[PDB]
Amino acid sequence: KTQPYDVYDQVEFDVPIGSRGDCYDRYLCRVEEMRQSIRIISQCLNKMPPGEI
Amino acid sequence: XXXXXXXXXXXXXXXXXXXXXXXXXXGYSMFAVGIGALLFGYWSMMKWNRERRRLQIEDFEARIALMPL
């Protein structure tokens, strides 16, 4: 969200942040990353301008 | 004509959907079947032990009846 690399902020991102610094909540956010990652891949399929490689 | 990779989304695969939900068991209803099986369990078992008593006294009666033994 802070530093764009190649066409960012235009794609909708969801970042999971917990509360406790234990191993379980540090695992839950990784699965929550995985469920909120297809949103980016679907938006990548939605926006594809044909041109140079 | 230029042919490149085409874009397709259609249904968008549904971005983050919950699949985990409460099924079968509710809470209080499981205790009615749980403790209910226990009360049915003892009542069925103890009636057989009363039927065992019919055999028990009759088994020991054979020893009393047999004196030539």
- A23 in a labelled binding site: yes
Query: B13: closest CA among A32, A40, A53?
Result: A40
The H-assigned helical ranges of A1-53 are: 25-35, 38-46
d(CA A8, CA A47): 12
Is there a contact between B11 and A45 (Cβ–Cβ < 8 Å)? Answer: no
- Which chain B residues are within 8 Å of A45, Cβ to Cβ? 7-9
B2 with A50: Cβ contact below 8 A: yes
Out of A36, A45, A50, closest to residue B16 by CB:
A36
Is there a contact between A17 and A29 (Cβ–Cβ < 8 Å)? Answer: yes
A45 with B7: Cβ contact below 8 A: yes
Number of H helices, E strands in chain B: 1, 0
Instruction: Please report the resolution in angstroms.
Output: 5.6
Query: A15: closest CA among A33, A28, A3, A40?
Result: A33
* Spatial CB neighbours of A29, under 8 Å, sequence gap ≥ 6: A16, A17, A18
Q: Which two tokens stand for residue A12?
A: 């909708």
> Is B15 buried (19+), middle (13-18) or exposed (0-12) by CB count in 10 A?
middle
Mutate one of B7, B10, B17, B18 to test the A interface: name it (highest A CB count within 10 A).
Answer: B7
